[PDB]
Amino acid sequence: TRFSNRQNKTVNYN
Amino acid sequence: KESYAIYVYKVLKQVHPDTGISSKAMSIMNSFVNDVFERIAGEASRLAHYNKRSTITSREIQTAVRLLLPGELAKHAVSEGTKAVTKYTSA
Amino acid sequence: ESYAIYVYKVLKQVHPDTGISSKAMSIMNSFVNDVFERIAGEASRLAHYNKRSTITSREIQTAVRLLLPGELAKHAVSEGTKAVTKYTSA
Amino acid sequence: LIRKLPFQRLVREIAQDFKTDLRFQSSAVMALQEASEAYLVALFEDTNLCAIHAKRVTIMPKDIQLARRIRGE
Amino acid sequence: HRYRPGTVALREIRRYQKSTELLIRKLPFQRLVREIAQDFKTDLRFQSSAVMALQEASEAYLVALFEDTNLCAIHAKRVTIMPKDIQLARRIRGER
Amino acid sequence: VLRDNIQGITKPAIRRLARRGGVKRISGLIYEETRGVLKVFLENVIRDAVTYTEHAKRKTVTAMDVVYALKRQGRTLYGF
Amino acid sequence: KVLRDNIQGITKPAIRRLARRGGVKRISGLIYEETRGVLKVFLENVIRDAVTYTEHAKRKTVTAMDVVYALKRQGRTL
Amino acid sequence: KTRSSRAGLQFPVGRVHRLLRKGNYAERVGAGAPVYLAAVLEYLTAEILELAGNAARDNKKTRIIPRHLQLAVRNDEELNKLLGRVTIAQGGV
Amino acid sequence: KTRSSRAGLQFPVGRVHRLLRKGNYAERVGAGAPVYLAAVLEYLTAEILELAGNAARDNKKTRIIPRHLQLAVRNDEELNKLLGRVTIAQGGVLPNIQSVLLP
DNA sequence: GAGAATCCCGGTGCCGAGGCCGCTCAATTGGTCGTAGACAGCTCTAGCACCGCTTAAACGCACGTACGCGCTGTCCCCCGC
DNA sequence: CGGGGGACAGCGCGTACGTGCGTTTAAGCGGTGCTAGAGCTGTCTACGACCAATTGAGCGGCCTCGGCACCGGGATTCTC
Numbered sequence: 077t078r079f080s081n082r083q084n085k086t087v088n089y090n
Numbered sequence: 091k092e093s094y095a096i097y098v099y100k101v102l103k104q105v106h107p108d109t110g111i112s113s114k115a116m117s118i119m120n121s122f123v124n125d126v127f128e129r130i131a132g133e134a135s136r137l138a139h140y141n142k143r144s145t146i147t148s149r150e151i152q153t154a155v156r157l158l159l160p161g162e163l164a165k166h167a168v169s170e171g172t173k174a175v176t177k178y179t180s181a
Numbered sequence: 182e183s184y185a186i187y188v189y190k191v192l193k194q195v196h197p198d199t200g201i202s203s204k205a206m207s208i209m210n211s212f213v214n215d216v217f218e219r220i221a222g223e224a225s226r227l228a229h230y231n232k233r234s235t236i237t238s239r240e241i242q243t244a245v246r247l248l249l250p251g252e253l254a255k256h257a258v259s260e261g262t263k264a265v266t267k268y269t270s271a
Numbered sequence: 272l273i274r275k276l277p278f279q280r281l282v283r284e285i286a287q288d289f290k291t292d293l294r295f296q297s298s299a300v301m302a303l304q305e306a307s308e309a310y311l312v313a314l315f316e317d318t319n320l321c322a323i324h325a326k327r328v329t330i331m332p333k334d335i336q337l338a339r340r341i342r343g344e
Numbered sequence: 345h346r347y348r349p350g351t352v353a354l355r356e357i358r359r360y361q362k363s364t365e366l367l368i369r370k371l372p373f374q375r376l377v378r379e380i381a382q383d384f385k386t387d388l389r390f391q392s393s394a395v396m397a398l399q400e401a402s403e404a405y406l407v408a409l410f411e412d413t414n415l416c417a418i419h420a421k422r423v424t425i426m427p428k429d430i431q432l433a434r435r436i437r438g439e440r
Numbered sequence: 441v442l443r444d445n446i447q448g449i450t451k452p453a454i455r456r457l458a459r460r461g462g463v464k465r466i467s468g469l470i471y472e473e474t475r476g477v478l479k480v481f482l483e484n485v486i487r488d489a490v491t492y493t494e495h496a497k498r499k500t501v502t503a504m505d506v507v508y509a510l511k512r513q514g515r516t517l518y519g520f
Numbered sequence: 521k522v523l524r525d526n527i528q529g530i531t532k533p534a535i536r537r538l539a540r541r542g543g544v545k546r547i548s549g550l551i552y553e554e555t556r557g558v559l560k561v562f563l564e565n566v567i568r569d570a571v572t573y574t575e576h577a578k579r580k581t582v583t584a585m586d587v588v589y590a591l592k593r594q595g596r597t598l
Numbered sequence: 599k600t601r602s603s604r605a606g607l608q609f610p611v612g613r614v615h616r617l618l619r620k621g622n623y624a625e626r627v628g629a630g631a632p633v634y635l636a637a638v639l640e641y642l643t644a645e646i647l648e649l650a651g652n653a654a655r656d657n658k659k660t661r662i663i664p665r666h667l668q669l670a671v672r673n674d675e676e677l678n679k680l681l682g683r684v685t686i687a688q689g690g691v
Numbered sequence: 692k693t694r695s696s697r698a699g700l701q702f703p704v705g706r707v708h709r710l711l712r713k714g715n716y717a718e719r720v721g722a723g724a725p726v727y728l729a730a731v732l733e734y735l736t737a738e739i740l741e742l743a744g745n746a747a748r749d750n751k752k753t754r755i756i757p758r759h760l761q762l763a764v765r766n767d768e769e770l771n772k773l774l775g776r777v778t779i780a781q782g783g784v785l786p787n788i789q790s791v792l793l794p
Numbered sequence: 795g796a797g798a799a800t801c802c803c804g805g806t807g808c809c810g811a812g813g814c815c816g817c818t819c820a821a822t823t824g825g826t827c828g829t830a831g832a833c834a835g836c837t838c839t840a841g842c843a844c845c846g847c848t849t850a851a852a853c854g855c856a857c858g859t860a861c862g863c864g865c866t867g868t869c870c871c872c873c874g875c
Numbered sequence: 876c877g878g879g880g881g882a883c884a885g886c887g888c889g890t891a892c893g894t895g896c897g898t899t900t901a902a903g904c905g906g907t908g909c910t911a912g913a914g915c916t917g918t919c920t921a922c923g924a925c926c927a928a929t930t931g932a933g934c935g936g937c938c939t940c941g942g943c944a945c946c947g948g949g950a951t952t953c954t955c
Binding site for chain 8: 092094097098100101102104105106108109110111112114115118119122123125126127128130131132134135138143144145146147148150151152155159160162163166167168170171172173174175177178179181
Binding site for chain 9: 184187188190191192194195196198199200201202204205208209212213215216217220221222224225228233234235236237238240241242245248249250252253256257258260261262263264265267268269271
């Protein structure tokens with residue numbers, strides 16, 4: 077709901 | 091005592107309410123919040139002194155953040171600040 | 182405004198034969214302002230940490246020990262002590 | 272990774288050199304461990320970069336001296 | 345005759361260390377900065393002294409990088425400077 | 441063309457600088473590499489200087505603005 | 521009981537573990553004594569300022585907050 | 599309504615407005631400045647927390663922990679390069 | 692008489708005090724602070740000026756010039772540590788060579 | 795051994811440095827008012843030292859191999875004119 | 876453009892580093908026990924801030940003289 081403006085690289089942290 | 095953890099909880103629930111947070115991480119957020127605050131404020135102050143100004147305004151912080159902050163984060167944050175102060179002032 | 186007059190005073194005290202290029206004096210003028218800012222910054226930080234309203238000799242005295250390397254610091258600090266004591270008596 | 276008891280005994284030794292009488296919060300010791308580990312690991316990554324640039328698998332003390340000069344100094 | 349390679353280099357190194365002038369050509373630098381600044385604003389009527397300060401800053405920064413990378417090259421035990429030594433230098437300096 | 445001016449900082453000028461750097465022997469690659477490094481560095485500093493300049497809302501950039509830009513980059517230059 | 525811990529406390533296996541964390545493949549047997557020295561210097565640098573912070577508080581005890589002040593400015597420069 | 603809720607912001611504008619005085623940063627402060635400050639503070643923390651939430655979620659943990667923060671911080675080059683001198687206690691490499 | 696001469700110092704104590712208040716570094720200043728500062732400043736300036744004078748005399752100039760200042764600071768390890776991030780226009784570099792480069 | 799480069803010596807120009815004078819602003823002096831800091835006391839807790847016990851880690855030695863170092867030969871490039 | 880030197884690759888050899896194994900050692904954790912100083916509170920006095928007046932020094936401008944730099948010639952020193 078606190079949306080994020082930047083468009084950024086998707087990450088997998090698993 | 092004078093701490094943001096409740097505000098961290100607010101935005102945490104606002105951003106990822108499926109995630110808890112360790113008190114350690116919460117403290118790191120508090121340390122982080124204080125660090126960025128003193129960074130932007132100290133800059134804006136010294137800019138105001140450089141401009142011979144006894145007052146700090148939206149422009150000073152809007153300039154300082156554009157100085158401190160990476161280019162995307164800057165214009166995104168700047169837009170967020172201008173939107174917010176627009177809502178505040180229009181209210 | 183400038184320190185050049187005082188720069189000349191100290192210069193003639195230490196090397197009365199010599200002169201200086203105004204370029205070099207401008208270098209000194211920038212340098213003294215730099216060190217003055219740096220020391221004042223540390224004084225502010227110390228005062229803020231200790232919730233003090235004021236800067237005293239104690240604050241600058243300790244801060245110098247943080248800026249300077251220890252031998253230069255020892256000279257600076259003892260000279261400052263002598264200066265402030267002479268001001269206190271005179 | 273590094274052992275709190277030896278580490279803190281070293282820390283107290285060095286403090287004893289400056290003050291000659293101290294007390295320490297355990298949180299201070301923890302913080303010093305975290306700082307020292309992070310600093311050392313970073314310096315290791317640098318010195319490894321140096322060693323591979325010299326086409327060695329072993330790091331050498333020369334690589335430490337060089338890395339410390341170039342980054343630190 | 346021809347002086348053997350490096351003796352010229354050594355004596356010019358000694359000259360340039362002992363001398364103190366700006367080594368980069370003046371107008372080329374003035375133009376270069378004029379262009380790259382223009383990406384950020386339509387027109388800046390630069391104070392020339394500001395250009396001079398930029399010239400000094402750039403010279404100092406480059407020469408520092410050059411001596412660092414030369415230290416890298418000698419650690420390699422080459423004497424030819426290679427771009428990889430620059431990349432390493434910037435990496436270790438944390439500039440990359 | 442001023443882009444070509446980044447090439448227009450000539451090979452022998454770079455050589456002169458390298459001699460002040462004390463370096464003995466240099467490969468042909470280094471010139472473009474250093475041109476890139478310089479471009480990045482200078483672009484950053486001027487970006488900061490112009491940010492000051494526009495905050496003062498005047499068309500003139502000053503040396504003082506450059507000094508502040510370097511200072512916030514984290515490096516200091518005297519004589520101004 | 522003749523040995524003294526301050527050097528010895530930092531010891532080959534722990535250094536090896538730090539190197540492995542640092543991704544190092546292999547190490548000369550000489551390295552450890554360099555790193556101990558460097559560590560001493562690094563430690564020496566920070567703790568001196570923490571002492572002086574503690575002096576300005578006139579307290580006998582050194583807190584993590586004093587450490588944070590010394591470590592903050594010194595870490596950013598280094 | 600409160601200044602924060604007037605701005606829609608989730609941070610203590612009154613505190614920071616006070617802090618701007620309390621830190622001597624200037625003897626005067628203009629009403630938008632603490633508001634504008636609060637807006638960017640909220641934005642900044644949201645960006646990092648979003649990444650850290652993914653890190654916890656990816657690690658199958660509800661708890662955000664220094665590891666998850668550190669992993670997030672180092673994965674964005676901008677945050678990482680912004681935070682290049684910040685060190686995370688108990689944040690592994 | 693002037694506070695500087697009451698202390699016995701050349702640097703302008705009144706200037707220092709004004710600059711401290713202008714810089715608002717704290718709400719208040721104790722009267723000893725500006726004199727102690729002026730003292731340490733004067734000491735530092737004398738100390739560096741000795742080395743610059745020495746360099747100028749070795750160049751057998753009477754006028755000190757920026758080169759002499761650079762050579763002074765880069766000779767003193769203490770000043771150099773104090774000034775490691777500081778750069779001097781027209782200062783050049785301290786002449787030095789890695790012996791392995793020599794023939 | 796010879797040639798090229800570097801240094802020293804002398805003269806002249808050009809400007810900057812140093813000094814003088816007068817004016818204006820800052821610094822100094824004195825008094826008043828309040829608050830911040832200093833001083834003292836009390837209570838709480840965290841820090842320090844040592845023992846008890848388990849277990850894991852560290853140390854020392856031997857065995858093996860792999861990596862580093864040095865040598866040699868060829869080729870390209872960069873340096874010098 | 877030409878020539879020479881450095882760079883690169885490949886090969887051999889020896890030593891050092893890594894791994895395994897066993898035994899020793901100290902860390903890690905918990906508990907014992909106490910005292911110091913940490914922190915907080917209250918009170919009082921000194922010190923600085925503020926205001927006003929006066930005086931002297933510093934700043935700015937101008938002038939004069941000396942120092943430094945540049946140019947030319949000859950001798951010394953290094954290099955092939």
